[PDB]
Every structure is written in structure tokens, then in C-alpha cells.
CSV table of C-alpha atoms and ligand atoms in Angstrom, one decimal:
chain,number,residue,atom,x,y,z
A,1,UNK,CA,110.2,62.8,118.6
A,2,UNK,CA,112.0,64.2,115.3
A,3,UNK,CA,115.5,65.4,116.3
A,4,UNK,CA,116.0,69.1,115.8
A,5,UNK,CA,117.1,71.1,112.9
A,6,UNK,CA,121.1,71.7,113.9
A,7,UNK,CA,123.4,73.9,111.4
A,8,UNK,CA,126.7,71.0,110.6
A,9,UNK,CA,124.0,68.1,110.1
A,10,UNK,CA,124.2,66.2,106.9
A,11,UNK,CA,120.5,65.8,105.6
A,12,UNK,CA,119.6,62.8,103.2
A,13,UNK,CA,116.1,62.9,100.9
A,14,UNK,CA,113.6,61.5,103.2
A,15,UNK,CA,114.7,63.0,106.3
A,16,UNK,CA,112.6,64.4,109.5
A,17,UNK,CA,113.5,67.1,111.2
A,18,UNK,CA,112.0,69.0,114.3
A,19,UNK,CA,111.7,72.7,114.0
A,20,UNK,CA,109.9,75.6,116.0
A,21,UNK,CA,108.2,72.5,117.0
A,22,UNK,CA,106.8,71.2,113.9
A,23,UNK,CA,108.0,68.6,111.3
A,24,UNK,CA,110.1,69.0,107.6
A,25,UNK,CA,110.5,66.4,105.5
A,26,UNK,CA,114.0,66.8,103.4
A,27,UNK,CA,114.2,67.2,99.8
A,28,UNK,CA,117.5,67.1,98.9
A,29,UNK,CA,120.6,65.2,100.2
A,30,UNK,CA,122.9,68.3,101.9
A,31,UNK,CA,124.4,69.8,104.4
A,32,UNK,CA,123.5,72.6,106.6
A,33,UNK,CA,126.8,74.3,106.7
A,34,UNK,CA,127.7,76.3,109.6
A,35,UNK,CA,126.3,80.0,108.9
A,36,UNK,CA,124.1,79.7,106.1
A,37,UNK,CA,121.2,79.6,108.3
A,38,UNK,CA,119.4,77.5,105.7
A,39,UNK,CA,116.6,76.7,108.7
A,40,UNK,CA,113.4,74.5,107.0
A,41,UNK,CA,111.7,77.6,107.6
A,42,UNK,CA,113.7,80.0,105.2
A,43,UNK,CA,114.2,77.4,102.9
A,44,UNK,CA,111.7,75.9,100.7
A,45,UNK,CA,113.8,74.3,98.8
A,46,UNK,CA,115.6,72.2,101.1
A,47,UNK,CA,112.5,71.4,103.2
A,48,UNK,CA,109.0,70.8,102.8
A,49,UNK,CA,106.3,70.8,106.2
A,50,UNK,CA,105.4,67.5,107.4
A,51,UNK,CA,106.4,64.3,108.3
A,52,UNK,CA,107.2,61.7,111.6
A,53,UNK,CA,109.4,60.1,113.3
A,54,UNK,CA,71.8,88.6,112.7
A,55,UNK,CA,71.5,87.0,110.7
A,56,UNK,CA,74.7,85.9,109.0
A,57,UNK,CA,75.8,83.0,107.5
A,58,UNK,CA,76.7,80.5,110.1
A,59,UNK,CA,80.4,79.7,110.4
A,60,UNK,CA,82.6,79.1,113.4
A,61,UNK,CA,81.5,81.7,116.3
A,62,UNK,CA,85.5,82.4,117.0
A,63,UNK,CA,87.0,82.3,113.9
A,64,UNK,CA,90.8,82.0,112.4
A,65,UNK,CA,90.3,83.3,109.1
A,66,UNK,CA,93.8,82.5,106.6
A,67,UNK,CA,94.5,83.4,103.3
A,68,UNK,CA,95.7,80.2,101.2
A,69,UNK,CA,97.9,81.1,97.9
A,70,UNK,CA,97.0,80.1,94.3
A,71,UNK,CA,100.9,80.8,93.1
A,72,UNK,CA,104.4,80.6,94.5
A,73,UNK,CA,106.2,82.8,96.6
A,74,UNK,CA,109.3,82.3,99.3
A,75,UNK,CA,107.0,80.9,101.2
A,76,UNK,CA,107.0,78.2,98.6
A,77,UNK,CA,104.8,76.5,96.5
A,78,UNK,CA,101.2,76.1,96.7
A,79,UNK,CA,100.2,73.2,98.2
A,80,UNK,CA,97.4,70.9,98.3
A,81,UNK,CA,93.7,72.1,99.7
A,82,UNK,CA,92.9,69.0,101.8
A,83,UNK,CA,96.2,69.6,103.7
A,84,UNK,CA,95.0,73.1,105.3
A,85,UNK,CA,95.0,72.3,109.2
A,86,UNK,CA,92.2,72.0,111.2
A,87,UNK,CA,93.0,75.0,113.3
A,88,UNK,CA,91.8,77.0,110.2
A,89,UNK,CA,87.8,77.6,110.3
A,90,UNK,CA,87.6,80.0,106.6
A,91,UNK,CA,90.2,79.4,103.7
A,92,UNK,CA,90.1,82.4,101.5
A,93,UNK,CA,92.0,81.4,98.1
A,94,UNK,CA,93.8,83.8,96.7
A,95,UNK,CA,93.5,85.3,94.4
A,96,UNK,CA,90.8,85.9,92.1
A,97,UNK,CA,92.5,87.2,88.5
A,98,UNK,CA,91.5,90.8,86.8
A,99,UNK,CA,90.3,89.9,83.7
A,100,UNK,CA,88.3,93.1,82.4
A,101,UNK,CA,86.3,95.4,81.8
A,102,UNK,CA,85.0,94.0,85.0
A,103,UNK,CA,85.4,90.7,84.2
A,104,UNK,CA,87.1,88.3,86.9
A,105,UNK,CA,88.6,84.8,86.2
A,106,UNK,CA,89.8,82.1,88.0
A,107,UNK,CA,92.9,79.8,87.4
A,108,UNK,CA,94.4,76.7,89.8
A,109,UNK,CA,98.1,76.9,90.6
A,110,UNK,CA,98.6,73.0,89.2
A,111,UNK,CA,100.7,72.3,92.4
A,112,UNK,CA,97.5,72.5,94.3
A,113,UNK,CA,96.5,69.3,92.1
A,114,UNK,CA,93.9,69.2,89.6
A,115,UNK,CA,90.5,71.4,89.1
A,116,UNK,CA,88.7,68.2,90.0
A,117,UNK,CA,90.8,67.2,93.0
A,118,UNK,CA,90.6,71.3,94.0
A,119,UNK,CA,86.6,71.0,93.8
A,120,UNK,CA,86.5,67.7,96.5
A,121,UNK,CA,89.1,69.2,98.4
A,122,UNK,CA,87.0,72.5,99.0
A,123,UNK,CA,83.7,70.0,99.4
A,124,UNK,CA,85.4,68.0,101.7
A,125,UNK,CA,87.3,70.8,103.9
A,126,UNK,CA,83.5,72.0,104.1
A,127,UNK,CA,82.0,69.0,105.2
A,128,UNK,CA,84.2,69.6,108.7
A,129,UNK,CA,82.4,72.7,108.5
A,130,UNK,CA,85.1,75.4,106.9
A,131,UNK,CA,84.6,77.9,104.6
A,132,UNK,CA,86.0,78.4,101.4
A,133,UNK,CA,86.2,81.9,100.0
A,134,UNK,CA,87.3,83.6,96.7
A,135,UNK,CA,89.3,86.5,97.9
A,136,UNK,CA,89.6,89.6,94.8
A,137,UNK,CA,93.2,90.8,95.0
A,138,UNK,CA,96.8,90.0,94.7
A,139,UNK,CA,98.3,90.8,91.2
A,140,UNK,CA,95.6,91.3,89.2
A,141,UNK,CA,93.6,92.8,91.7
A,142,UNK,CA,92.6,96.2,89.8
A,143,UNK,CA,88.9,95.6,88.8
A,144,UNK,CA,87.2,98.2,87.2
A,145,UNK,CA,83.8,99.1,88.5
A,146,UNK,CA,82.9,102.4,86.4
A,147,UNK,CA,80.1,101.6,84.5
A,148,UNK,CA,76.9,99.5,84.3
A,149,UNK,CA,78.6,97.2,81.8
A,150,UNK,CA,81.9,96.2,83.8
A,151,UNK,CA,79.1,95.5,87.4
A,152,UNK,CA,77.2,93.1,84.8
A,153,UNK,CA,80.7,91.4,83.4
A,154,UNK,CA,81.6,91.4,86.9
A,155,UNK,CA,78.2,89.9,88.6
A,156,UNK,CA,78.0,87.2,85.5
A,157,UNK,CA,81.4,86.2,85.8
A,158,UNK,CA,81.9,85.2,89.7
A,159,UNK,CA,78.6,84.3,89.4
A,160,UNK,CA,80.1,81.2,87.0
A,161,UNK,CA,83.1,80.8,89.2
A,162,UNK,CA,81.2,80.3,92.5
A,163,UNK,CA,78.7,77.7,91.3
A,164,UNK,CA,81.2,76.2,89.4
A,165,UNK,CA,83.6,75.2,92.2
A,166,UNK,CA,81.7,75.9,95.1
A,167,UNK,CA,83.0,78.9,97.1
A,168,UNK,CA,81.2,79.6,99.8
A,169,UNK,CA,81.6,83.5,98.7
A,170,UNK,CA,84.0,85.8,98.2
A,171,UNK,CA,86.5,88.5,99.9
A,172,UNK,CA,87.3,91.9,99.0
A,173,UNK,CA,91.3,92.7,99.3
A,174,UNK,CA,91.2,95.1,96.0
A,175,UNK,CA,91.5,98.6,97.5
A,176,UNK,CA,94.8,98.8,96.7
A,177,UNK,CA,94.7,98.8,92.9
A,178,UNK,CA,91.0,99.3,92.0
A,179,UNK,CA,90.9,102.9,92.7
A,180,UNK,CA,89.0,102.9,95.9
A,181,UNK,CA,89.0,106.7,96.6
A,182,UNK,CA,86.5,109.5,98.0
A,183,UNK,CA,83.8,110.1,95.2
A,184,UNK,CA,85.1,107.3,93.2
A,185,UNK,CA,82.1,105.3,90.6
A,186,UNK,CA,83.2,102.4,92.0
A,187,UNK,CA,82.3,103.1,95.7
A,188,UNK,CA,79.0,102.8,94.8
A,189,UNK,CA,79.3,100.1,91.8
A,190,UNK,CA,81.1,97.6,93.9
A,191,UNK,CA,78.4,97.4,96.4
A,192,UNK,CA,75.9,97.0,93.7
A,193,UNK,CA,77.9,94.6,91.5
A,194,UNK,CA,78.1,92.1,95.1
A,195,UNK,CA,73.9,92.8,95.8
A,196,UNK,CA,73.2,91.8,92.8
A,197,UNK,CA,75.7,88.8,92.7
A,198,UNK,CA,74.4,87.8,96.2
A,199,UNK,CA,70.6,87.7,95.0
A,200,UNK,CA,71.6,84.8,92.3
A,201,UNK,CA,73.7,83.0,94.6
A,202,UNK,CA,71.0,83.0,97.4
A,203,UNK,CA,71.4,83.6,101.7
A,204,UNK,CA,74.7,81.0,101.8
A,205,UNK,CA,76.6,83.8,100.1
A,206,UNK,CA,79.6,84.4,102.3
A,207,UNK,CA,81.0,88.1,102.2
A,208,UNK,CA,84.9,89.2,104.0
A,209,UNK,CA,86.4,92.0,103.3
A,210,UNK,CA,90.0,93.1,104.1
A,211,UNK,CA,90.6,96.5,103.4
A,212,UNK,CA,93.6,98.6,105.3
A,213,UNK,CA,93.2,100.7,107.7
A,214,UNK,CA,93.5,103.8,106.3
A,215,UNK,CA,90.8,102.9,104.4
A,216,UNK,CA,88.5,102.6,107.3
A,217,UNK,CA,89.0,104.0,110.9
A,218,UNK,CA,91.0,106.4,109.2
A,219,UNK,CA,87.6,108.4,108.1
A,220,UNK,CA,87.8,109.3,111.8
A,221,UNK,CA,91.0,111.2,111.5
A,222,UNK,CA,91.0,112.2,107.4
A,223,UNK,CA,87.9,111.8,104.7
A,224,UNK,CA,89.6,112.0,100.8
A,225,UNK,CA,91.7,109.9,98.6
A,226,UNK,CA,92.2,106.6,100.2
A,227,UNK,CA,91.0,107.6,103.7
A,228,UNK,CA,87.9,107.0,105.0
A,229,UNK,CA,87.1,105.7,101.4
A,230,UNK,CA,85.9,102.0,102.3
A,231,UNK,CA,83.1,103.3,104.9
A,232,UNK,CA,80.6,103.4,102.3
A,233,UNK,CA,81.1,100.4,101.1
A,234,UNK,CA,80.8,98.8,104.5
A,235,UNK,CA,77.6,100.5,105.3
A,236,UNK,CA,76.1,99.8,101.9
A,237,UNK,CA,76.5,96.2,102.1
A,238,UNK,CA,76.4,96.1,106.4
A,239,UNK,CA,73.1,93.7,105.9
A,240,UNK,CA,75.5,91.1,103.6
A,241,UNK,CA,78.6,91.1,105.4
A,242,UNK,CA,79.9,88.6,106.9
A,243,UNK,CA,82.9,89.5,108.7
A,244,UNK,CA,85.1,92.3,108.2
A,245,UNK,CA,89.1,92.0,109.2
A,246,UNK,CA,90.8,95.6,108.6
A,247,UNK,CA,94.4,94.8,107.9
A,248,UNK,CA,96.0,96.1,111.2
A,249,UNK,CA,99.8,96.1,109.3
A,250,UNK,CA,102.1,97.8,106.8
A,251,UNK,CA,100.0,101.2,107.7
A,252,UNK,CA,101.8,102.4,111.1
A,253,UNK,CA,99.8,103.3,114.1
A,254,UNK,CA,96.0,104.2,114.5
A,255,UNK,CA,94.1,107.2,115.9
A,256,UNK,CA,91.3,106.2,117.3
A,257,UNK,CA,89.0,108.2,120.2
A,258,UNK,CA,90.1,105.9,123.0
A,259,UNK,CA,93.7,107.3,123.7
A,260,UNK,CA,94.9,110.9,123.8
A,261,UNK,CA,97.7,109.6,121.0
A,262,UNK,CA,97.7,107.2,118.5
A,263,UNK,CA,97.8,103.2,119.5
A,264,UNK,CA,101.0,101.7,118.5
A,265,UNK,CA,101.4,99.6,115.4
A,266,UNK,CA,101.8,95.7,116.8
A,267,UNK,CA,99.8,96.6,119.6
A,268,UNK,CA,96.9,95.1,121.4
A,269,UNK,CA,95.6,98.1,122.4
A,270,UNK,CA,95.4,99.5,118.4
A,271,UNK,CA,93.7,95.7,117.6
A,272,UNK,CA,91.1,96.0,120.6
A,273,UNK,CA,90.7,100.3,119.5
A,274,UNK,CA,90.8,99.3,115.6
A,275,UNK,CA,87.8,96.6,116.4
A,276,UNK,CA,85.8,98.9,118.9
A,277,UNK,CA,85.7,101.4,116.2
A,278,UNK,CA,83.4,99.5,114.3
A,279,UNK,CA,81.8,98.2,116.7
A,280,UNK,CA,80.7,101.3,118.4
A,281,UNK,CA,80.8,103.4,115.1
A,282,UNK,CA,82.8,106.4,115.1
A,283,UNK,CA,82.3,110.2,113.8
A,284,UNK,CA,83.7,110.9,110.5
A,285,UNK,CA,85.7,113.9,109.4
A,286,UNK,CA,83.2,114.3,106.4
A,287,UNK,CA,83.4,118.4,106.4
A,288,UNK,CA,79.4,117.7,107.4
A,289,UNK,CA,78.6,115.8,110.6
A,290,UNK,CA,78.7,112.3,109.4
A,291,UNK,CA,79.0,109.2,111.5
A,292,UNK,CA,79.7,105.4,110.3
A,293,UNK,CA,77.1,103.3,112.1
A,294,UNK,CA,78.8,100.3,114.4
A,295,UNK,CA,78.3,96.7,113.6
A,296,UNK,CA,77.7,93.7,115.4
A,297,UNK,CA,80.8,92.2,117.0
A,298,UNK,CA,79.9,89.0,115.1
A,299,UNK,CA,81.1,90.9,112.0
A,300,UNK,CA,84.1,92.2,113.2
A,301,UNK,CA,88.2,90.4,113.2
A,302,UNK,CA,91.4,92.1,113.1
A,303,UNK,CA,93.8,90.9,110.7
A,304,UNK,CA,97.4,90.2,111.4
A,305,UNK,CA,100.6,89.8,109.7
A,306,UNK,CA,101.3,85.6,110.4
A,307,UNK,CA,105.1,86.0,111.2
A,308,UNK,CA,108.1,87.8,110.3
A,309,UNK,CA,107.9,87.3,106.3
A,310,UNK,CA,104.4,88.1,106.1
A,311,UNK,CA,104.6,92.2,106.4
A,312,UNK,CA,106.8,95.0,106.4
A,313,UNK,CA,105.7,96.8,109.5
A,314,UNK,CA,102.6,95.5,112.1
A,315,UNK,CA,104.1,92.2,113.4
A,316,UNK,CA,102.1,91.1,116.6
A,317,UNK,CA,103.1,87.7,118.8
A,318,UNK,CA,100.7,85.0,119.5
A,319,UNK,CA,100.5,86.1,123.2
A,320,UNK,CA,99.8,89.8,122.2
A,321,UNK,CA,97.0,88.4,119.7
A,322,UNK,CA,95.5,86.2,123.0
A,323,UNK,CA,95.2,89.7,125.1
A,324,UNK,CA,93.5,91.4,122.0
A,325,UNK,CA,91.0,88.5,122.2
A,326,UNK,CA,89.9,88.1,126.1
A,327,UNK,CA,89.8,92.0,126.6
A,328,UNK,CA,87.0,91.9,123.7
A,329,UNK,CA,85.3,89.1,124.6
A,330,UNK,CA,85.9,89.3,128.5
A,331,UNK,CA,87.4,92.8,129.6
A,332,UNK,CA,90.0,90.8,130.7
A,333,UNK,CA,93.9,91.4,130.3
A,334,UNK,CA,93.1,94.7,128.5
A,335,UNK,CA,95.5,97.1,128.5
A,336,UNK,CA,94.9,101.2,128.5
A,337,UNK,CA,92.2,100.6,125.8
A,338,UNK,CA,89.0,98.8,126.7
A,339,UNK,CA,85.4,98.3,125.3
A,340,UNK,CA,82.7,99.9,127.1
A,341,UNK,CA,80.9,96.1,127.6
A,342,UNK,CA,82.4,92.8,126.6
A,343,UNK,CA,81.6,91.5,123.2
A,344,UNK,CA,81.4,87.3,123.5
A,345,UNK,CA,80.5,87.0,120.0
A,346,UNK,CA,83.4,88.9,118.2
A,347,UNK,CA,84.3,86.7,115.3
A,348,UNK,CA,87.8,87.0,115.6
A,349,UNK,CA,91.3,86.6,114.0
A,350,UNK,CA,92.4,87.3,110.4
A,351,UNK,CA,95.8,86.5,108.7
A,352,UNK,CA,98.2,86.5,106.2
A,353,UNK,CA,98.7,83.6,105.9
A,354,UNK,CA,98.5,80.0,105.8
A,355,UNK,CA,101.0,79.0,103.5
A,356,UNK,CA,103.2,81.6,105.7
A,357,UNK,CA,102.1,79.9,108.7
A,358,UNK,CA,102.7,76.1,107.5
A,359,UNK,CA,106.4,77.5,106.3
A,360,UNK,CA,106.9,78.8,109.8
A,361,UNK,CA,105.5,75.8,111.0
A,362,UNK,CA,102.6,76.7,112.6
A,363,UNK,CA,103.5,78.8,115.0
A,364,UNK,CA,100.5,81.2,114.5
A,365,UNK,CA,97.6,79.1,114.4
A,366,UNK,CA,98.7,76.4,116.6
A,367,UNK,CA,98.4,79.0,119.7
A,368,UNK,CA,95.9,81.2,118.3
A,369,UNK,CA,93.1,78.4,117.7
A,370,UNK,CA,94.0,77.4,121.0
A,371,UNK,CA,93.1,81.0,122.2
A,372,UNK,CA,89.9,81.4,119.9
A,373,UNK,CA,88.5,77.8,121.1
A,374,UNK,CA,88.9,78.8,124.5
B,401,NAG,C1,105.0,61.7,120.2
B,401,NAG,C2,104.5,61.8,118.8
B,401,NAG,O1,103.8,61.0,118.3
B,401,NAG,N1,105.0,62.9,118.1
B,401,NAG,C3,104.6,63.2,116.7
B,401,NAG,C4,105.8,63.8,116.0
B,401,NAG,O2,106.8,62.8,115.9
B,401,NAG,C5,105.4,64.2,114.6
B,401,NAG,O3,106.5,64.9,114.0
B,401,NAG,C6,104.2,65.2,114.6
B,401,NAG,C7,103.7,65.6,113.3
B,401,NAG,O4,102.6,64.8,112.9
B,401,NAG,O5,103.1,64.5,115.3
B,401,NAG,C8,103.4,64.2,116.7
B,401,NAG,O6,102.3,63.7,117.3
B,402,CA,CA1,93.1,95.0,101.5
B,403,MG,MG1,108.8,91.4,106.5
């Protein structure tokens, strides 16, 4: 075994350390001076991981779905496709760039190698039977969706990028900048734009999307603006989707028809209520009677914040996540929510994110695929 990380420990280049159970190689010669807390895991520049001393399209039935960045960030620098870990079962890259009007581009971060290395790494990650996904979103997530122009600029141009490097799909994560409110053009352009995108790319076409909770269940509770704003979406392109993962974080708690008060944030109990709301469907407060139609389980995952540094606010532990799990799929462990019959085919866990995950070494979806493969 590698010796543990230890704060008074004089590190050369080269050297292995052990931390939260997982392996940093050193990159430069130093000392970890007593209160600094420069730990491999807040410090990207001192360490880097590794080192020793229906019907849908079919993808894994209890899925950890992980979002791989295309920049640098204090998580550190992107790395290498290939070296995403088996535990992973759909790598959504991200992100796509804004390029307008309705345009979308796509640019490598060089540190994941070169375009051509990229390409066989996302062939060969396939090959053991991942998906590779284009997520929309990030920085230059705004698109603009108002007119029939911008849908075509947007349908032509992912259209190029998919065949070109072989994304399985893509993954909406755009609400947030592109204007996805109540009555908004783009409600309605958006699900058009990935229809008609979807019929050149043919029945493999992969579809996630990641919107925030407010966005969704929150129709239940509030219908204008943001809230309640994604449900048309979802039910216009229900027949396409592949899995949906409402981001249970950074929004506080949920109201959902299964408790008397709101489930709190970090909580199973507002992962399992968050997913039974779309799986049951759930009345929304349209002003009229309307009512968002429930999906299959095998399109539904919650999404997670991966540690610590990966939210502000919605911060679950890899136990918490495991109780979500078997009281969907089982009814067992649940706590005072429960589904009305067990779901054995819901798709699973969402996060942000792998690089997050691989600074933290692992300590997400180490346990977590554990959980998912049974
Ligand atoms: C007993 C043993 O082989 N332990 C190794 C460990 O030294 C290494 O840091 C880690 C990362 O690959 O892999 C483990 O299997
Ligand atoms: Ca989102
Ligand atoms: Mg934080």
C-alpha cells in the first residue's frame, strides 16, 4: 500500500501518496507544512490522481451518469477520456459552446489530448459499452431558440458535431441561460429543433436532460417564470428521452404530495419524492386542471452534487444516495416517503462530476457503482 497523505512530510516529483483511499502522484518537490492543509484533494497543483506503490436506447439498466469537463477549474485540469473509470456507465462532455443565432460549436480542451486521440478515446470507452454524450450548457450555454432560422442553425450544426466525433447524443443543462420560462418560443422550439435532429441521426440518438428542480416538480407547487417551465418540454419529447436527472441541489427543499411539508434538501426522502413525481406524474398549478403524465422509471435518475466542491447547497453522502436507490427499486430502507410499488428498472444516479469525483479520489463512484451493480 501507498503511505498516507501526512501534513510535515517532504514530497519529491514522483511521489505516491494514499488519500481518502485512493492514489496521487506528486508533481512538485515540497513540503506539506503543518496547517496549510494543502491535501491532494484541494490541491491540484501539488498532486495529480493516480499512481502505485420502451423503447429506449439500450444503456446500462442502473446507471451512474457523470459529467466530464472540457476546461479547467479547481478541480483541475481536464484530463484524458480513456482515463474515465469503469464505475462510470454515460460520460456527458461538457460543454457544448453558444455559438449563435442557434448555432452550437464544439472545441477540445488540448489537455484532453488531441481531436483524433479524443475520437478513439470516446470509440473505445464505447466499445466497453459507455455512453458518450454532448451535454448543452456551462459558459456559453444561452442558445437561442426563437425562430425557425436559429432551430435549423441549431439542428445542422450538432447534427455536424455528433457524426463527426461520434456522440452517442446529447444533454440538455441550458435552462439556466437560455430563457426557459412559461410561454417562452423556445419551449416549444427546443423540442422541435432535437425531433428534427433526432430524425437525421436515426433511433441510436441518446437524449438526458438535467434541468433544476424548480424547473420541473416545481409546476406542482408554482406554474410561471422558471417554475414548472421544463414540463413541456419533457412531455413533448417523452417518446425520445432517454433519461432524465433533475438536479436535486443549489435549489433548497422540494414540495412534493407525499409529505405534509417540504422534503429536506440532501435528503433521501426529497431524491425518492423528486423521482416518484415523475414517475407517477403529478397535478400542475396551471390556473386550469393540468397534469404532467408520469414516465417510465427507466427514464428517471436523480442528480447529485459529487462532494463538497461540487455545489453550494444539496450535498448528499454515498450511504444516503444507497437508501434513495433500494427504496425505489425495493421498498426497502425507505424512509417517511415511499413509492406506491417498487420500480426495479429505475435508471439511476446522476452527478456533478467526474473530474470532481477523480480530485476527491473517488469517493462517489467507488461506493455508488457498488450500490447501482447490486
Ligand atoms: C495491494 C495493492 O495492489 N494495492 C494497490 C495500490 O497500491 C494502488 O495505489 C491502487 C491504485 O491502482 O491499486 C491497488 O490495487
Ligand atoms: Ca440544468
Ligand atoms: Mg460548495
Amino acid at each position: 500500500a501507498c503511505p498516507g497523505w501526512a501534513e510535515g512530510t517532504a514530497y519529491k516529483v514522483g511521489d505516491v501518496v494514499s488519500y481518502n483511499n485512493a492514489n496521487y502522484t506528486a508533481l512538485v518537490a515540497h513540503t506539506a507544512y503543518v496547517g496549510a492543509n494543502w491535501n491532494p484533494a484541494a490541491s491540484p497543483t501539488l498532486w495529480t490522481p493516480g499512481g502505485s506503490c420502451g423503447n429506449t436506447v439500450p444503456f446500462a439498466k442502473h446507471a451512474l451518469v457523470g459529467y466530464w469537463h472540457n476546461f479547467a477549474n479547481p478541480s483541475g485540469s481536464a484530463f484524458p477520456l480513456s482515463q474515465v473509470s469503469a464505475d462510470w456507465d454515460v460520460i456527458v462532455v461538457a460543454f457544448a459552446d453558444d455559438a449563435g443565432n442557434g448555432n452550437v460549436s464544439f472545441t477540445l480542451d488540448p489537455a484532453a489530448g488531441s481531436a483524433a486521440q479524443f475520437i478513439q478515446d470516446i470509440r473505445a470507452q464505447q466499445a466497453k459499452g459507455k455512453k458518450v454524450v454532448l451535454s448543452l450548457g456551462g459558459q456559453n450555454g444561452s442558445v437561442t431558440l426563437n425562430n425557425a432560422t436559429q432551430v435549423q442553425n441549431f439542428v445542422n450544426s450538432l447534427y455536424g458535431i455528433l457524426t463527426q466525433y461520434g456522440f452517442d447524443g446529447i444533454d440538455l443543462d441550458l435552462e439556466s441561460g437560455s430563457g426557459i420560462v412559461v410561454g417562452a418560443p423556445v419551449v416549444s422550439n427546443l423540442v422541435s429543433a432535437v425531433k428534427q435532429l433526432k430524425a437525421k441521426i436515426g433511433p441510436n440518438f441518446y437524449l438526458s436532460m438535467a434541468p433544476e428542480h424548480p424547473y420541473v416538480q416545481g409546476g406542482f407547487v408554482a406554474y410561471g417564470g422558471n417554475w414548472g417551465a421544463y414540463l413541456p418540454i419533457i412531455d413533448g419529447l417523452r417518446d425520445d428521452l432517454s433519461v432524465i436527472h433533475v438536479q436535486y441541489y443549489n435549489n433548497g427543499g422540494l414540495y412534493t404530495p407525499y409529505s405534509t411539508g417540504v422534503l429536506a434538501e440532501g435528503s433521501a426522502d426529497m431524491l425518492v419524492g423528486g423521482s416518484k413525481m415523475l414517475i407517477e406524474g403529478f397535478p400542475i398549478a396551471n390556473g386550469a386542471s393540468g397534469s404532467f403524465k408520469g414516465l417510465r422509471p427507466d427514464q428517471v435518475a436523480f442528480g447529485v452534487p459529487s462532494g463538497r466542491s461540487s455545489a453550494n447547497s444539496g450535498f448528499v453522502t454515498a450511504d444516503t444516495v444507497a437508501k434513495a436507490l433500494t427504496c425505489l427499486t425495493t421498498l426497502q430502507g425507505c424512509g417517511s416517503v415511499k413509492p406506491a410499488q417498487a420500480y426495479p428498472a429505475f435508471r439511476g444516479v446522476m452527478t456533478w462530476s467526474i473530474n470532481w469525483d477523480r480530485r476527491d479520489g473517488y469517493t462517489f463512484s467507488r461506493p455508488v457503482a457498488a450500490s447501482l451493480r447490486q
